[PDB]
């Protein structure tokens, strides 16, 4: 797959110290929904197995079939590597700017995406960068209840430590609530057994 280079050279796509930047890529997407005026709340969850889950009540990642590839948008998004999200020379390094949940995919033993759209609950799954589960309807919900959950398990062999840095995570989420006044951002640490909420009028 086109995600192959990311797994050969993870350091050229992410910070391989710890999986935090993976987390920040998913959060950025949910906060983009808030910025356009579609999500009001972003819930983040550090699970006890050191996986991260990021839920927003936005429109839902798009699930329409692109005709030329005959696959749902959400899959294109998760599988397509974007160029120029991170770059380097021996004097200068940049990242990321206006990147990709696809690097999260490439560097995860599992990813699960759930999308609430039009009263349907859609599900797609990935393992080691490869699709293990086709987009499918696994439940129903209210027509008003829309948005996206991304749940991912970082592959520890790509990082110096598989552990999320709690203080780096929490500052990011605080920073995002400041950037988007009125959005509610929550963090639930199933490890340290804490609950946190930020909202700025």
Ligand X SMILES: Nc1nc(-n2ccnc2)c2nc(-c3cccnc3)sc2n1
Q: Tell me which of 41, 47, 59, 188 binds ligand X, using CB under 6 A.
A: 59
Return binding residues for ATP: 29, 56, 97-101
Task: CB nearer to Mg ion: give 128 or 198.
Answer: 198
Q: How far apart are CA 50 and CA 23, in angstroms?
A: 11
Under the binding rule (CB under 6 A), the answer on residue 146 touching ligand X is no
Which among 97, 98, 101, 14 has a CA at the least distance from the CA of 62?
A: 101
Task: CB nearer to ligand X: give 39 or 46.
Answer: 39
Under the binding rule (CB under 6 A), the answer on residue 56 touching ligand X is yes
First to last CA, the chain: 45
The Cα diameter of the chain in Å comes to: 53
Q: Measured from the CB of residue 29, what is the shortest distance to ligand X in angstroms?
A: 3
Q: Which residue is closest to ligand X by CB?
A: 29
Residue 27 binding: pick among ligand X, Mg ion, none (C-beta 5-8 Å cut-off by kind)? none
DSSP per position, 43-102: EEEE-TTS-EEEEE-SS----PEETTTTEEHHHHHHH-PPTTSEEE-SS-EEE-----HH
Task: CB nearer to ligand X: give 31 or 169.
Answer: 31
Under the binding rule (CB under 6 A), the answer on residue 173 touching ligand X is no
Return binding residues: 29, 56, 97-101
Q: How far apart are CA 79 and CA 76, in angstroms?
A: 5
Residue 155 binding: pick among ligand X, Mg ion, none (C-beta 5-8 Å cut-off by kind)? none
Cα-Cα-Cα-Cα torsion 112, 19, 38, 100, nearest 10 degrees, comes to -80
Which among 105, 85, 104 has a CA at the least distance from the CA of 95?
A: 85
Q: How many positions of this chain bind Mg ion (CB under 5 A)?
A: 1
Q: Tell me which of 99, 166, 175, 191 binds Mg ion, using CB under 5 A.
A: 175
Q: Tell me which of 14, 20, 24, 30 binds ligand X, using CB under 6 A.
A: 30
3-state secondary structure of 13: coil
Q: How far apart are CA 187 and CA 150, in angstroms?
A: 14
Q: Tell me which of 23, 58, 129, 154 binds ligand X, using CB under 6 A.
A: 58
Site for ligand X, rule CB under 6 A? 29-30, 33, 56, 58-62, 77, 101, 148
Site for Mg ion, rule CB under 5 A? 175
């Amino acid at each position: 797959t086109g995600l192959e280079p990311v797994r050969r050279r993870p350091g050229m796509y992410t910070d391989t110290t710890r999986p935090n930047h993976l987390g920040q890529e998913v959060i950025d997407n949910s906060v983009d929904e808030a910025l356009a005026g579609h999500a009001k709340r972003v819930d983040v969850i550090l699970h006890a197995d050191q996986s991260l889950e990021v839920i927003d009540d936005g429109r839902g990642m798009p699930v329409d079939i692109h005709p030329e590839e005959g696959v749902p948008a959400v899959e294109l998004i998760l599988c397509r590597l974007h160029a120029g999200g991170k770059f380097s020379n021996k004097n200068y390094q940049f990242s990321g700017g206006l990147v990709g949940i696809s690097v999260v995919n490439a560097l995860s033993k599992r990813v699960e995406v759930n999308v609430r759209r039009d009263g349907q609950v859609y599900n797609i799954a990935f393992e080691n960068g490869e699709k293990v589960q086709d987009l499918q309807v696994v439940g129903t919900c209210g027509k008003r209840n829309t948005g996206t959950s991304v749940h991912f398990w970082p592959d520890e062999t790509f990082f110096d430590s598989p552990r999320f840095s709690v203080s780096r995570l929490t500052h990011v989420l605080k920073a995002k609530a400041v950037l988007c006044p009125g959005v509610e951002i929550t963090f639930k640490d199933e490890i340290n057994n804490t609950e946190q909420r930020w909202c700025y009028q």
